[PDB]
Design an enzyme around this catalytic site. Structure first.
Site, PDB file in Angstrom:
ATOM      1  N   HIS I 201      47.114  54.834  13.129  1.00 13.74           N
ATOM      2  CA  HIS I 201      46.364  55.575  12.499  1.00 13.74           C
ATOM      3  C   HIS I 201      45.227  55.006  11.881  1.00 13.74           C
ATOM      4  N   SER I 205      43.917  55.163  18.846  1.00 14.08           N
ATOM      5  CA  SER I 205      44.401  54.874  20.090  1.00 14.08           C
ATOM      6  C   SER I 205      43.453  54.359  21.291  1.00 14.08           C
ATOM      7  N   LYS I 227      49.723  69.494  25.349  1.00 13.59           N
ATOM      8  CA  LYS I 227      49.738  68.577  26.400  1.00 13.59           C
ATOM      9  C   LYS I 227      51.212  67.621  25.978  1.00 13.59           C
ATOM     10  N   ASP I 228      51.543  67.678  24.856  1.00 13.85           N
ATOM     11  CA  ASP I 228      52.821  67.048  24.475  1.00 13.85           C
ATOM     12  C   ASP I 228      53.871  67.985  24.680  1.00 13.85           C
ATOM     13  N   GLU I 271      76.159  49.318  29.346  1.00 15.85           N
ATOM     14  CA  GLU I 271      75.231  50.319  29.909  1.00 15.85           C
ATOM     15  C   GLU I 271      73.984  49.608  30.709  1.00 15.85           C
TER      16      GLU I 271
HETATM   17  C1  HEM Z   1      61.321  54.982  18.759  1.00 15.20           C
HETATM   18  C2  HEM Z   1      60.468  54.271  19.215  1.00 15.20           C
HETATM   19  C3  HEM Z   1      58.763  54.610  19.091  1.00 15.20           C
HETATM   20  C4  HEM Z   1      58.263  55.583  18.771  1.00 15.20           C
HETATM   21  C5  HEM Z   1      58.760  57.184  18.215  1.00 15.20           C
HETATM   22  C6  HEM Z   1      56.879  55.484  18.876  1.00 15.20           C
HETATM   23  C7  HEM Z   1      55.617  56.432  18.582  1.00 15.20           C
HETATM   24  C8  HEM Z   1      54.463  56.154  19.069  1.00 15.20           C
HETATM   25  C9  HEM Z   1      53.493  57.143  19.116  1.00 15.20           C
HETATM   26  C10 HEM Z   1      53.694  58.468  18.754  1.00 15.20           C
HETATM   27  C11 HEM Z   1      52.346  56.699  19.674  1.00 15.20           C
HETATM   28  C12 HEM Z   1      50.947  57.202  19.742  1.00 15.20           C
HETATM   29  C13 HEM Z   1      51.011  58.152  20.924  1.00 15.20           C
HETATM   30  C14 HEM Z   1      51.454  57.015  22.249  1.00 15.20           C
HETATM   31  O1  HEM Z   1      50.309  56.207  22.655  1.00 15.20           O
HETATM   32  O2  HEM Z   1      52.425  57.301  22.763  1.00 15.20           O
HETATM   33  C15 HEM Z   1      52.451  55.000  19.683  1.00 15.20           C
HETATM   34  C16 HEM Z   1      51.740  54.246  20.277  1.00 15.20           C
HETATM   35  C17 HEM Z   1      52.073  52.848  20.556  1.00 15.20           C
HETATM   36  N1  HEM Z   1      53.220  52.265  20.837  1.00 15.20           N
HETATM   37 FE1  HEM Z   1      55.093  53.287  20.264  1.00 15.20          FE
HETATM   38  N2  HEM Z   1      56.728  54.170  19.740  1.00 15.20           N
HETATM   39  C18 HEM Z   1      57.937  53.907  19.745  1.00 15.20           C
HETATM   40  C19 HEM Z   1      58.315  52.476  20.167  1.00 15.20           C
HETATM   41  C20 HEM Z   1      57.358  51.407  20.562  1.00 15.20           C
HETATM   42  C21 HEM Z   1      57.729  50.394  21.085  1.00 15.20           C
HETATM   43  C22 HEM Z   1      59.362  49.698  21.503  1.00 15.20           C
HETATM   44  C23 HEM Z   1      56.715  49.641  21.252  1.00 15.20           C
HETATM   45  C24 HEM Z   1      56.174  48.005  21.874  1.00 15.20           C
HETATM   46  C25 HEM Z   1      57.062  46.929  22.110  1.00 15.20           C
HETATM   47  C26 HEM Z   1      55.276  50.379  20.914  1.00 15.20           C
HETATM   48  C27 HEM Z   1      54.049  50.102  20.987  1.00 15.20           C
HETATM   49  C28 HEM Z   1      53.014  50.932  20.879  1.00 15.20           C
HETATM   50  C29 HEM Z   1      51.654  50.733  20.914  1.00 15.20           C
HETATM   51  C30 HEM Z   1      51.125  49.315  21.352  1.00 15.20           C
HETATM   52  C31 HEM Z   1      50.929  51.878  20.748  1.00 15.20           C
HETATM   53  C32 HEM Z   1      49.460  52.088  20.928  1.00 15.20           C
HETATM   54  C33 HEM Z   1      49.214  52.506  22.217  1.00 15.20           C
HETATM   55  C34 HEM Z   1      47.610  52.667  22.411  1.00 15.20           C
HETATM   56  O3  HEM Z   1      46.989  53.317  21.668  1.00 15.20           O
HETATM   57  O4  HEM Z   1      47.346  52.227  23.508  1.00 15.20           O
HETATM   58  N3  HEM Z   1      56.023  51.641  20.599  1.00 15.20           N
HETATM   59  N4  HEM Z   1      53.582  54.918  19.489  1.00 15.20           N
HETATM   60  C1  LIG Z   2      79.628  44.305  28.804  1.00 16.87           C
HETATM   61  O1  LIG Z   2      79.580  43.512  27.728  1.00 16.87           O
HETATM   62  C2  LIG Z   2      78.186  43.664  27.185  1.00 16.87           C
HETATM   63  C3  LIG Z   2      77.711  44.857  26.144  1.00 16.87           C
HETATM   64  O2  LIG Z   2      78.776  45.659  25.728  1.00 16.87           O
HETATM   65  C4  LIG Z   2      79.016  46.842  26.555  1.00 16.87           C
HETATM   66  C5  LIG Z   2      76.490  44.934  25.769  1.00 16.87           C
HETATM   67  O3  LIG Z   2      76.203  45.681  24.800  1.00 16.87           O
HETATM   68  C6  LIG Z   2      75.312  43.943  26.137  1.00 16.87           C
HETATM   69  C7  LIG Z   2      74.133  44.038  25.575  1.00 16.87           C
HETATM   70  C8  LIG Z   2      73.967  43.443  24.230  1.00 16.87           C
HETATM   71  C9  LIG Z   2      73.260  42.546  23.843  1.00 16.87           C
HETATM   72  C10 LIG Z   2      71.926  42.100  25.009  1.00 16.87           C
HETATM   73  C11 LIG Z   2      73.144  42.115  22.516  1.00 16.87           C
HETATM   74  C12 LIG Z   2      73.105  42.988  21.469  1.00 16.87           C
HETATM   75  C13 LIG Z   2      72.322  42.375  20.224  1.00 16.87           C
HETATM   76  C14 LIG Z   2      72.876  41.958  19.356  1.00 16.87           C
HETATM   77  C15 LIG Z   2      71.924  41.186  18.123  1.00 16.87           C
HETATM   78  C16 LIG Z   2      74.284  41.738  18.929  1.00 16.87           C
HETATM   79  C17 LIG Z   2      74.786  42.703  18.312  1.00 16.87           C
HETATM   80  C18 LIG Z   2      75.098  42.244  16.827  1.00 16.87           C
HETATM   81  C19 LIG Z   2      76.078  42.732  15.954  1.00 16.87           C
HETATM   82  C20 LIG Z   2      77.091  43.726  16.323  1.00 16.87           C
HETATM   83  C21 LIG Z   2      76.350  41.854  14.681  1.00 16.87           C
HETATM   84  C22 LIG Z   2      76.870  42.657  13.572  1.00 16.87           C
HETATM   85  C23 LIG Z   2      75.930  43.572  12.855  1.00 16.87           C
HETATM   86  C24 LIG Z   2      75.545  44.770  12.905  1.00 16.87           C
HETATM   87  C25 LIG Z   2      76.837  45.556  13.141  1.00 16.87           C
HETATM   88  C26 LIG Z   2      74.614  45.711  12.191  1.00 16.87           C
HETATM   89  C27 LIG Z   2      73.691  44.704  11.297  1.00 16.87           C
HETATM   90  C28 LIG Z   2      72.779  45.414  10.360  1.00 16.87           C
HETATM   91  C29 LIG Z   2      71.448  45.415  10.372  1.00 16.87           C
HETATM   92  C30 LIG Z   2      70.537  44.903  10.962  1.00 16.87           C
HETATM   93  C31 LIG Z   2      70.853  46.235   9.084  1.00 16.87           C
HETATM   94  C32 LIG Z   2      75.813  43.069  26.772  1.00 16.87           C
HETATM   95  C33 LIG Z   2      74.686  42.009  27.494  1.00 16.87           C
HETATM   96  C34 LIG Z   2      77.179  42.965  27.492  1.00 16.87           C
HETATM   97  O4  LIG Z   2      77.408  41.864  28.343  1.00 16.87           O
HETATM   98  C1  LIG Z   3      47.550  59.094  21.051  1.00 17.47           C
HETATM   99  O1  LIG Z   3      47.510  60.704  20.439  1.00 17.47           O
HETATM  100  C2  LIG Z   3      48.646  60.774  19.778  1.00 17.47           C
HETATM  101  C3  LIG Z   3      49.730  61.239  20.418  1.00 17.47           C
HETATM  102  O2  LIG Z   3      49.637  61.614  21.856  1.00 17.47           O
HETATM  103  C4  LIG Z   3      49.069  62.609  22.416  1.00 17.47           C
HETATM  104  C5  LIG Z   3      51.172  61.634  19.934  1.00 17.47           C
HETATM  105  O3  LIG Z   3      51.742  62.062  20.600  1.00 17.47           O
HETATM  106  C6  LIG Z   3      51.086  61.138  18.559  1.00 17.47           C
HETATM  107  C7  LIG Z   3      52.475  61.629  17.561  1.00 17.47           C
HETATM  108  C8  LIG Z   3      53.212  63.014  18.036  1.00 17.47           C
HETATM  109  C9  LIG Z   3      53.934  63.559  17.083  1.00 17.47           C
HETATM  110  C10 LIG Z   3      53.991  63.084  15.886  1.00 17.47           C
HETATM  111  C11 LIG Z   3      54.806  64.718  17.384  1.00 17.47           C
HETATM  112  C12 LIG Z   3      56.001  64.094  18.215  1.00 17.47           C
HETATM  113  C13 LIG Z   3      57.211  64.290  17.421  1.00 17.47           C
HETATM  114  C14 LIG Z   3      58.029  63.507  16.578  1.00 17.47           C
HETATM  115  C15 LIG Z   3      57.441  62.029  16.494  1.00 17.47           C
HETATM  116  C16 LIG Z   3      59.074  63.926  15.802  1.00 17.47           C
HETATM  117  C17 LIG Z   3      60.034  64.823  16.400  1.00 17.47           C
HETATM  118  C18 LIG Z   3      60.595  65.895  15.600  1.00 17.47           C
HETATM  119  C19 LIG Z   3      60.763  67.027  15.903  1.00 17.47           C
HETATM  120  C20 LIG Z   3      60.723  67.812  17.276  1.00 17.47           C
HETATM  121  C21 LIG Z   3      61.448  67.996  14.673  1.00 17.47           C
HETATM  122  C22 LIG Z   3      62.053  67.325  13.682  1.00 17.47           C
HETATM  123  C23 LIG Z   3      62.454  68.369  12.732  1.00 17.47           C
HETATM  124  C24 LIG Z   3      62.984  68.406  11.369  1.00 17.47           C
HETATM  125  C25 LIG Z   3      63.423  69.255  10.552  1.00 17.47           C
HETATM  126  C26 LIG Z   3      63.294  66.917  10.793  1.00 17.47           C
HETATM  127  C27 LIG Z   3      62.410  66.772   9.526  1.00 17.47           C
HETATM  128  C28 LIG Z   3      63.393  66.308   8.364  1.00 17.47           C
HETATM  129  C29 LIG Z   3      63.289  66.945   7.205  1.00 17.47           C
HETATM  130  C30 LIG Z   3      61.920  67.770   6.677  1.00 17.47           C
HETATM  131  C31 LIG Z   3      64.178  66.860   6.008  1.00 17.47           C
HETATM  132  C32 LIG Z   3      50.134  60.761  17.758  1.00 17.47           C
HETATM  133  C33 LIG Z   3      50.070  60.496  16.024  1.00 17.47           C
HETATM  134  C34 LIG Z   3      48.759  60.550  18.412  1.00 17.47           C
HETATM  135  O4  LIG Z   3      47.922  60.192  17.792  1.00 17.47           O
END
Ligand code: HEM
Ligand SMILES: COC1=C(OC)C(=O)C(C/C=C(\C)CC/C=C(/C)CC/C=C(\C)CC/C=C(\C)CCC=C(C)C)=C(C)C1=O
Ligand SMILES: COC1=C(OC)C(=O)C(C/C=C(\C)CC/C=C(\C)CC/C=C(\C)CC/C=C(/C)CCC=C(C)C)=C(C)C1=O
Ligand SMILES: CCCCCCCCCCCCCCCCCC(=O)OC[C@H](COP(=O)([O-])OCC(O)COP(=O)([O-])OC[C@@H](COC(=O)CCCCCCCCCCCCCCCCC)OC(=O)CCCCCCCCCCCCCCCCC)OC(=O)CCCCCCCCCCCCCCCCC
Ligand SMILES: CCCCCCCCCCCCCCCCCC(=O)OC[C@H](COP(=O)([O-])OCC(O)COP(=O)([O-])OC[C@@H](COC(=O)CCCCCCCCCCCCCCCCC)OC(=O)CCCCCCCCCCCCCCCCC)OC(=O)CCCCCCCCCCCCCCCCC
Ligand SMILES: CCCCCCCCCCCCCCCCCC(=O)OC[C@H](COP(=O)(O)O)OC(=O)CCCCCCCCCCCCCCCCC
Ligand SMILES: CCCCCCCCCCCCCCCCCC(=O)OC[C@H](COP(=O)(O)O)OC(=O)CCCCCCCCCCCCCCCCC
Ligand code: HEM
Ligand code: HEM
Ligand code: HEM
Ligand SMILES: COC1=C(OC)C(=O)C(C/C=C(\C)CC/C=C(/C)CC/C=C(\C)CC/C=C(\C)CCC=C(C)C)=C(C)C1=O
Ligand SMILES: COC1=C(OC)C(=O)C(C/C=C(\C)CC/C=C(/C)CC/C=C(\C)CC/C=C(\C)CCC=C(C)C)=C(C)C1=O
Lengths: 122, 50, 52, 48, 59, 70, 55, 376, 376, 48
Positions: I201, I205, I227-228, I271
């Site tokens: 923000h 974007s 749209k979402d 998985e």
């Molecule tokens: C739980 C995971 C994630 C959430 C909730 C999330 C959420 C979002 C949202 C809401 C946006 C704005 C709307 C959109 O462009 O889709 C966004 C944009 C973006 N996200 Fe994600 N994201 C996630 C994971 C990731 C990951 C894994 C990557 C990269 C490794 C990433 C990179 C980006 C980038 C670069 C943008 C900007 C795109 C643009 O404006 O061209 N995000 N993200």
């Molecule tokens: C059949 O076999 C196999 C799995 O099994 C079903 C797998 O999944 C995976 C996939 C796993 C991969 C690629 C590695 C996952 C990544 C890491 C870092 C290993 C996980 C580390 C642990 C559990 C160390 C302990 C830490 C914990 C629990 C949390 C740490 C806390 C914080 C960061 C706050 C592969 C390749 C696999 O061949």
């Molecule tokens: C490029 O333009 C953009 C988009 O693309 C069109 C986007 O999409 C978004 C982001 C979209 C948002 C924030 C809405 C999607 C929902 C999210 C991330 C959360 C999902 C939550 C739901 C459905 C409800 C959760 C409910 C509760 C009660 C949890 C909260 C807990 C408490 C209050 C205790 C942004 C900012 C944007 O800029």
């Protein structure tokens, strides 16, 4: 109620004078006045009354508040020569604030609001 | 620039105006909480060791 | 039976003695570092034209 | 202050209070809450 | 009045990369001294009641 | 950030040009007496109410236990 | 005075003149606080001396 | 300059390093940092304890014992959690009493007070469901007595009770769902605390003088970090004493007996921090009226920023009545730990009536009289 | 305005109602809101699941079975939570591929990309340790094979391994701590998601044209809510199909066998969303070199905003090379589910070499050539 | 355009690079992390 409310006012005045004596003894050690105890953030009428004032009165009020806050940080009181000169009941705000509140009461009987709001930050 | 046109002070021999025109080198701090060292005391402070 | 309810009472007391000693020394050191930081404010001189 | 200070300062007048039509239309939301609860629980023999 | 020495300042205090290892060795020795004092006081007070006193008594 | 009109001279000394904790021993009895002078009435009315009501309640509870005896 | 006396009495497990001296020092320091300085030492000494003369 | 290039540096600098703060704040303004530190301590020690606890009625008590004896540092963690809950409630109660004394909930800080009351309600629920997890006698029977208050609601009382239990009695599904809810609610507490703190930073803190302080403000990070460290060390001393020297001082011995649904204890009492609510409930001989009285207490707490007039030192009549209110709440705390008796019932009724009188009659009316005395 | 008087309404209005968004965003900009919806769904289903799951050996399998057959709506909750991880990874992978295609991590959105990569790593760890929890054959043996890969770091190997296990093999302490770590990590995911959205923000974007779009911006809350909602309804259709008609399609049948530490299955595969990393690891005939290559992939992902030149269309060579990269990654995903064979080893080595070649050679050098062609 | 774009354009000269003294002062942090790790673990007399 009118038979007993004729003489309920001198008892109110006596209690008010005793209260102001005690609190003004408390206030004078910090160099404060009774009107310095009113916060523009706490009341929007006080915020309105404070901008109706000449600049030197506001400068003096800020100076007194700064001195009192410095004294509060240092866990001190005013020295005896300054403490004997303190006038905790010399009003600078009560006339303007009374006028502001009367205007707001007048506007409310005709359904109009006050022409100001609370202080909003950010 | 002149201070009358930039700072725009009040006119008079007020306590702030006297120090503004001629500050004194005999600055008195408050010593109820901390007593000062003698002025011009040199050396790296002992508080780092503490 | 009193040992059975609290099997680590001796170790807990030794650790508590060490902790109380360490925290008591650290309270004095932290009070020192608090008063050092607040010293230019607690000893500042403010002169103004207000007498009241 | 805004709650009881406004009543004590004389800022709450009949001319500043909401109208009876406003109180009727605002208070009509009570039937919406009742029918929403009846829709959520469906605790009736009303369908017959 | 009391003041830290200049030559001792230029060695252990002017750089953080020299100050931090000195801090760690001082921390190590402070922990050792506190451990020694607490253990000596505890063992002196409770002499004859510990398990090691019974074991050394049975030798 | 909230301009405040004010006229003053402010002086401040370096924290390495004054002492740190030496005056704390001199002012400690005075601060103790000042604290109790300022908060004496509230602490006393708290203590009187709490301990008086607790003592009356415990006394009457003991009398209630004695009344159940044979 | 009475509470400090009986507290040191029960803490030391025996009755002797130390409890009276400690109670006198505490009471006299309470009396002598906030005064110029012969007095925060002089008043504990006077109350401890009264306890010692009493014993 | 470097914090001007990254957003996260800028937000942290503004709200932690260079945030203006009144220079005359005393040590009564340390309760918030201590409460945050105690929440962080509770979250850390709870996360560490969750790696050895089993939420089943056949293994809960046994896993608690195994964690106590066999897990390295497990006794420190378990005692730290159980006594950090009590220290958390001490710090929060003193924080609330500070706000009550100074009238800190007034305008423009109504949102801060309301989010505080929300935080306190969530805290109470969190601690109550955490106490059930050891599955001792107090853990079982207190959950039985308190969740049986739902039957005071007519028609749909028993249905809500059985829905919360998962059965016809407190049993294994109750313990499992309580464990999940207990793991979950501290994160809501962390979010609520972040919102609560960001609400206060809009206007700043009040000062012990009760006046406007915008002329005398200093940076938070340089000055109040050390002042908060001092109070944190005083809290760490008390924490160390409670963990190592008196670990079961603030507990109950009956929670070391395993739970038995066929033999109740003679004196079912909660933890000390729920004793005033319990005294309010026990003083009234009607379950619905007791639940209503508790709800009215919390409604009066919510309505404080809008009915309350009267603040700190210079408003002396309400300042004197504050100590009577404090004596009343401590008398309510003491009365909860005692058995039901005609004199304790009478004294509890009078104490509850005085609490309502102070909250709803003294704070508006006496506050208005002292405003008229001082500025009329 | 009503939103100008409460600070909560001002932030919500500014960032969800009136936020200016480019008007030419297509349906490949709905990945983020779908990922957030999947995160919220996983959190809700899991918190509901944890009220019937017991995190102990000799109870875990039976508790999952009791959840499946005896808890009302429990089968829906379990199948939704299992397939939601797959849909969460599908959506997040398509989001990352969108960012790879358009060059979305470039200046000034490098913090957005870096926080995304951190989110992806936490997602991987969360999904793995959550897959251990049902305590089947695949759970036990995957946890055994992955955690016993710390014996590649010299000297400090089996020490870290035995400290992770809480013993000498994967057993009850490993499962018990994996439950706590898995419960806790999604809240870190939610906080990192909030920080990630807040970082975007600052600058807004990108658009499909790849040009500056400050002249043509429209409100978010009216135009991009429906749209979402359309994409969310498509995702709900796929989710409902997966839950109700093919609930075990994406899984492994061996995870329905209770775990046996003395008998190993014929094929141990994770998985599907972990399969490309598994293929990279399994292709290299050295454990330490495989872990080094896995770390190098994520290091090159972090370095992408500072080495990657070239965006979507009007940069056509890198646009064409993106499809070879997509084919390479999908081939690595297919190879991870096969057996170790000399031809599959050779093909996996070639695919890993091309993945590194594209990430580290094509993106800087071909992008620089494109800039020299277009604006040179 | 921070990173490889800075070196492709010729913005990384012999000047604007850190000096030898700057690299030595940064390079002196290598001993601090080693001493901190040895302080945390304490493997006394473990050097072969
Ligand atoms: C739980 C995971 C994630 C959430 C909730 C999330 C959420 C979002 C949202 C809401 C946006 C704005 C709307 C959109 O462009 O889709 C966004 C944009 C973006 N996200 Fe994600 N994201 C996630 C994971 C990731 C990951 C894994 C990557 C990269 C490794 C990433 C990179 C980006 C980038 C670069 C943008 C900007 C795109 C643009 O404006 O061209 N995000 N993200
Ligand atoms: C059949 O076999 C196999 C799995 O099994 C079903 C797998 O999944 C995976 C996939 C796993 C991969 C690629 C590695 C996952 C990544 C890491 C870092 C290993 C996980 C580390 C642990 C559990 C160390 C302990 C830490 C914990 C629990 C949390 C740490 C806390 C914080 C960061 C706050 C592969 C390749 C696999 O061949
Ligand atoms: C490029 O333009 C953009 C988009 O693309 C069109 C986007 O999409 C978004 C982001 C979209 C948002 C924030 C809405 C999607 C929902 C999210 C991330 C959360 C999902 C939550 C739901 C459905 C409800 C959760 C409910 C509760 C009660 C949890 C909260 C807990 C408490 C209050 C205790 C942004 C900012 C944007 O800029
Ligand atoms: C014992 C009897 C118990 C009952 C009486 C309690 C104390 C008596 C005085 C009360 C008081 O006003 O306290 C503040 C009082 C003086 O206050 P003040 O100067 O008027 O105002 C400062 C503020 O009040 C304070 O603000 P500040 O932040 O500037 O000062 C911080 C610090 C002040 O810093 C100090 O000087 C304290 C030092 C701590 C000792 C630890 C030593 C161990 C390690 C040593 C390392 C130190 C390194 C320094 C070395 C370099 C020295 C050159 O104070 C503390 O935190 C210490 C505790 C103070 C009172 C807390 C308890 C109150 C409730 C009572 C419960 C008891 C029942 O300070 C002290 O109590 C310290 C002096 C010791 C008093 C003993 C008797 C002297 C004669
Ligand atoms: C408990 C949390 C409050 C600790 C306050 C942090 C602090 O100033 O260090 C005191 C203190 C360091 O001891 P010190 O040698 O007396 O203080 C260093 C100098 O006096 C004076 O050092 P300085 O003026 O350079 O301190 C500025 C401070 C940066 O201070 C801030 O910006 C504070 C921001 C958070 C405030 C937390 C209040 C709650 O950055 C640091 O050097 C420490 C960063 C760690 C935070 O923090 C500790 O490491 C003690 C344990 C706390 C954890
Ligand atoms: C039968 C059972 C026997 C049980 C015996 C043990 C009972 C508890 C132990 C004894 C408690 C009594 C002394 C407590 C002293 C505590 C300290 C204190 O009060 O100082 C605070 C406080 C300190 O103020 P500060 O130093 O300014 O904080 O002191 C006061 O202000 C004085 C308090 C006096 C008020 C309480 C007097 C005792 C109440 C008894 C009422 C009896 C009613 C009888 C009605 C029926 C008659 C038929
Ligand atoms: C806004 C609402 C505010 C509500 C205020 C609630 C009360 C807050 C303050 C409560 C003070 C603590 C009392 C806790 C024990 C109560 C026990 C009880 O009443 O039942 C007796 C109870 C049962 O007695 P029975 O059933 O009558 O035989 O006895 C016990 O359980 C043992 C009592 C042990 C008391 C320990 C006292 C010292 C503990 C540490 C004190 C720390 C002070 C602060 C230091 C840290 C500062 C940061
Ligand atoms: C993420 C945060 C937390 C987690 C994971 C957690 C976890 C646990 C667990 C597993 C237990 C049972 C182990 C035992 O009985 O010793 C427990 C007990 C308990 N928890 Fe926490 N907890 C957390 C935060 C809190 C908070 C914020 C409070 C606030 C008051 C709290 C209060 C309690 C109480 C009172 C008990 C009962 C202790 C006893 O009497 O044994 N917990 N917690
Ligand atoms: C987990 C619980 C809490 C945390 C972490 C917390 C945190 C804080 C912090 C850091 C402050 C700023 C400085 C201070 O006054 O200490 C503050 C102020 C305040 N808090 Fe709390 N608080 C909590 C609970 C509560 C509760 C339960 C209430 C009231 C029912 C409350 C009401 C207030 C008020 C009114 C202020 C402003 C007081 C003033 O600035 O004068 N808070 N809080
Ligand atoms: C607060 C959030 C969450 C909670 C409480 C939670 C809870 C659980 C529980 C109790 C289980 C074991 C029961 C079962 O497997 O049926 C489980 C399994 C699992 N979790 Fe979640 N989960 C959460 C979030 C997530 C997230 C965000 C992901 C993926 C990124 C995830 C992925 C998984 C997977 C793949 C399984 C294995 C399911 C199976 O094969 O049966 N979980 N989770
Ligand atoms: C003038 O007034 C003020 C104060 O008073 C003097 C303060 O003190 C503070 C500082 C506030 C503090 C120390 C309170 C702590 C804050 C909060 C919001 C408590 C809740 C936070 C928790 C429990 C964090 C723990 C959770 C984490 C780390 C997430 C989980 C992730 C991992 C474990 C990896 C401020 C800003 C202030 O203005
Ligand atoms: C030893 O034992 C005991 C306790 O314990 C330590 C107690 O406290 C109490 C008494 C406590 C009182 C009166 C104050 C606390 C009161 C309540 C009602 C706590 C709130 C908890 C409830 C209603 C349980 C239901 C749980 C829910 C709804 C989970 C939260 C989840 C969501 C809202 C989604 C008693 C008597 C007790 O003898």
């Amino acid at each position: 109620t009118s038979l007993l409310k004729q003489v309920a006012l001198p008892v109110f005045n006596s209690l008010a004078t005793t209260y102001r004596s005690v609190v003004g003894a408390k206030l004078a050690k910090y160099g404060l006045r009774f009107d310095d105890l009113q916060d523009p953030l706490k009341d929007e009428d006080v915020a309105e009354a404070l901008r109706r004032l000449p600049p030197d009165v506001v400068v003096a009020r800020n100076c007194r508040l700064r001195r009192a806050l410095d004294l509060s940080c240092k866990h001190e009181a005013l020295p005896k020569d300054l403490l004997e000169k303190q006038t905790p009941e010399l009003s600078y705000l009560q006339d303007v604030l009374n006028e502001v509140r009367a205007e707001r009461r007048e506007r409310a009987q005709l359904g109009a609001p006050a022409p100001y709001t609370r202080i909003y930050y950010d | 620039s002149d201070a009358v046109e930039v700072f725009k002070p009040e006119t008079g021999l007020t306590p702030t105006n006297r120090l503004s025109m001629a500050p004194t080198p005999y600055i008195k701090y408050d010593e109820h909480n901390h007593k000062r060292f003698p002025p011009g005391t040199e050396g790296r402070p002992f508080a780092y060791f503490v | 039976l009193a040992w059975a309810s609290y099997p680590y009472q001796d170790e807990m007391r030794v650790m508590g003695i060490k902790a109380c000693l360490m925290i008591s020394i650290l309270i004095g050191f932290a009070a020192y570092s608090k008063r050092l930081r607040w010293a230019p404010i607690k000893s500042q001189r403010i002169v103004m034209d207000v007498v009241n | 202050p805004i709650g009881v200070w406004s009543v004590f300062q004389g800022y709450v007048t009949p001319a500043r209070l909401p109208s009876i039509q406003t109180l009727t239309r605002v208070g009509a939301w009570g039937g919406v809450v009742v029918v929403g609860g009846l829709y959520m629980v469906q605790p009736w023999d009303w369908l017959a | 009045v009391m003041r830290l020495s200049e030559a001792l300042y230029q060695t252990f205090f002017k750089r953080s990369t020299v100050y931090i290892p000195m801090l760690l060795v001082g921390a190590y020795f402070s922990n050792e001294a506190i451990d020694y004092a607490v253990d000596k006081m505890w063992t002196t007070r409770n002499k004859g009641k510990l398990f090691s006193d019974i074991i050394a008594e049975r030798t | 950030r909230q301009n405040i009109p004010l006229r003053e001279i402010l002086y401040q000394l370096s924290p390495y040009q004054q002492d740190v904790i030496r005056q704390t021993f001199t002012n400690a009895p005075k601060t103790f007496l000042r604290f109790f002078k300022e908060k004496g009435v509230g602490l006393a009315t708290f203590g009187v109410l709490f301990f008086g009501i607790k003592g009356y309640t415990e006394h009457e509870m003991h009398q209630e236990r004695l009344a159940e005896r044979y | 005075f009475s509470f400090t006396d009986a507290t040191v009495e029960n803490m030391r497990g025996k009755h002797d003149m130390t409890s009276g001296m400690v109670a006198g020092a505490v009471t006299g320091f309470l009396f002598g606080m906030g005064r110029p300085m012969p007095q925060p030492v002089a008043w504990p000494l006077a109350f401890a001396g009264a306890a010692v003369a009493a014993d | 300059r470097m914090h001007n290039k990254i957003q996260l540096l800028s937000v942290l600098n503004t709200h932690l390093v260079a945030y203006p703060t009144p220079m005359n704040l005393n040590y009564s303004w340390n309760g918030g940092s201590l409460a945050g530190m105690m929440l962080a301590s509770q979250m850390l020690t709870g996360i560490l304890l969750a790696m050895h606890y089993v939420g089943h009625v056949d293994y809960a008590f046994a896993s608690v014992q195994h964690l106590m004896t066999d897990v390295p540092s497990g006794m420190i963690l378990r005692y730290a959690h159980a006594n950090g809950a009590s220290l958390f409630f001490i710090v929060v109660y003193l924080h609330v009493l500070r706000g009550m004394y100074y009238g800190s909930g007034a305008q423009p800080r109504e949102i801060v007070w309301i989010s505080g009351v929300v935080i306190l309600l969530v805290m109470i629920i969190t601690a109550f469901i955490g106490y059930v997890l050891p599955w001792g006698q107090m853990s079982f029977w207190g959950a039985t007595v308190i969740t049986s208050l739902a039957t005071a609601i007519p028609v749909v009382g028993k249905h809500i009770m059985y829905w919360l239990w998962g059965g016809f009695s407190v049993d294994n599904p109750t313990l499992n769902r309580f464990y999940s809810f207990h793991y979950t609610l501290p994160f809501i507490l962390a979010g609520l605390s972040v919102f609560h703190i960001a609400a206060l930073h809009q206007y700043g803190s009040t000062n012990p003088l009760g006046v406007n302080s915008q002329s005398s403000l200093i940076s938070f990070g340089s000055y109040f970090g050390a002042k908060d460290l001092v109070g944190a060390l005083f809290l760490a001393l008390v924490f160390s004493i409670l963990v190592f020297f008196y670990p079961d001082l603030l507990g109950h011995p009956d929670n070391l007996i395993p739970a038995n649904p066929y033999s109740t204890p003679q004196h079912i009492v909660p933890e000390w921090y729920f004793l005033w609510v319990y005294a309010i409930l026990r003083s009234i001989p009607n379950k619905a009226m007791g639940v209503l009285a508790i709800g009215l207490v919390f409604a009066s707490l919510f309505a404080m920023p809008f009915i309350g007039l009267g603040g700190g030192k210079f408003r002396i009549i309400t300042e004197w009545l504050y100590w009577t209110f404090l004596a009343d709440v401590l008398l309510l705390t003491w009365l909860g730990g005692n058995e039901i008796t005609p004199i304790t019932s009478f004294v509890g009724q009078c104490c509850t009536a005085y609490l309502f009188f102070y909250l709803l009659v003294c704070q508006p009316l006496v506050g208005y009289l002292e405003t008229q005395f001082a500025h009329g």
